Design a protein around this ligand. Structure first.
Ligand SMILES: O=c1ccn([C@@H]2O[C@H](COP(=O)(O)OP(=O)(O)O)[C@@H](O)[C@H]2O)c(=O)[nH]1
Length: 358
């Protein structure tokens, strides 16, 4: 009879991380008859949308004390009391600050349990990275995060790389027929520079050789700035804008139908779920080799390419070769190149990472 507690600071209730957590919780509560799951949130308000939790048992610590020393002390106390009521065997922290809370509350509460980190963002691009050292073991969604954890002094043996899940598909998006233009796809929020660097996408494509089209599914404040840039570069007649779409992969299948590659030019990424989605549909991905994620999914020459951050020359080379056919990715086998990310095997490896450390 195992009970697992997932804890973190309040989240919005919409986002990639929330989806992964509710699914991991839900399949946990079916695994061994039903080893039980519940949540604990540290909140300064109750603005978190509760939809994703409708089937999940959860409790909260509310404190809007403005001095953070006092607020954290109250959070630790509230969690210490919940620990006594609940007696979890395992506590998994979905952010780094909660590893400190869980550690301090374990000592205060006198309870025994094992503390795992399971952060969903690169430690270096987020606020409280040094609190990672308060967890017992670590669940890393990428090789990049495992490296940042080791950088703080943690032994590699105490860190399991668990990736993140994606659903198996039963449709393959084929390449365009030969003699048709190459079809590139960009799916994501538009930022001209900043995190997403749509500037780099447009700069690279403008320098390429051969016939191509770019389909952009997404929106953002930089829309007009990106549209002006495509006009400036003279590529606007090869770009089709779809705005934000609730079902981007339905738009791909029904409206675009044939895709050469998905492109991602980001400066950084928390976890680029978009790449996994694309490869689940057999679409190769050419991505910047940024912190973090793309290098754990992309196998160069097999399901796409990586380029060193800022190496737009290299990015262009990858585009030219896939347009010409000098390099060809086989869409029919690409879905199998991300085997370890698919739901069932993901959960088996995730489950084994938790219980192997006990
Ligand atoms: O028009 C869009 C563009 C993005 N996505 C989805 O949003 C995620 C990636 O979006 P984003 O680039 O904003 O990543 P984030 O910054 O939210 O982590 C992927 O799962 C996409 O399938 C979507 O549903 N509609």
């Amino acid at each position: 009879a195992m009970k697992i507690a997932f804890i973190g600071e309040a989240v919005s209730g919409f986002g990639g991380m929330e989806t992964v957590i509710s699914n991991v919780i839900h399949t946990f509560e079916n695994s061994s008859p039903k080893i039980n799951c519940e949540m604990f949130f540290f909140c300064r308000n109750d603005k978190m949308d509760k939809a994703w939790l409708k089937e999940i048992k959860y409790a909260q610590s509310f404190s809007n004390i403005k001095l953070s020393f006092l607020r954290r002390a109250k959070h630790v106390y509230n969690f210490s009391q919940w620990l006594k009521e609940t007696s979890p065997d395992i506590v998994i922290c979905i952010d780094v600050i909660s590893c400190l809370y869980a550690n301090k509350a374990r000592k205060k509460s006198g309870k025994h349990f094992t503390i795992f980190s399971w952060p969903h963002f690169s430690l270096d691009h987020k606020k409280h990275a040094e609190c990672i050292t308060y967890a017992d073991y670590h669940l890393a969604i990428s090789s990049g995060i495992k490296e940042q954890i080791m950088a703080r002094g943690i032994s590699a043996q105490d860190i399991s790389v668990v990736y993140n899940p994606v659903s198996i598909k039963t449709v393959i998006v084929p390449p365009p027929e030969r003699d048709k233009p190459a079809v590139f796809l960009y799916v994501g929020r538009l930022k001209f520079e900043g995190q997403k660097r749509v500037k780099d996408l447009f700069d690279g494509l403008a320098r390429t050789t051969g016939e191509w089209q770019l389909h952009i599914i997404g929106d953002g404040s930089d829309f007009e700035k990106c549209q002006a840039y495509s006009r400036e570069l003279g590529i606007e007649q090869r770009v089709i804008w779809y705005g934000w779409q609730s079902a981007p992969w339905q738009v791909v299948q029904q409206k675009i139908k044939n895709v050469t590659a998905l492109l991602l030019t980001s400066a950084f990424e928390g976890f680029p779920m978009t790449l996994l989605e694309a490869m689940s549909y057999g679409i190769p991905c050419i991505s910047s080799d940024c912190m973090s994620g793309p290098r754990d999914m992309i196998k160069p020459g097999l399901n796409g390419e990586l380029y060193t951050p800022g190496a737009i020359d290299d990015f262009v080379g990858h585009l030219n070769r896939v347009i010409s056919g000098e390099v060809k990715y086989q869409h029919d086998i690409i879905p199998g190149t991300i085997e370890r990310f698919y739901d069932v095997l993901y959960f088996k490896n995730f489950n084994n990472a938790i219980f192997s450390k006990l």
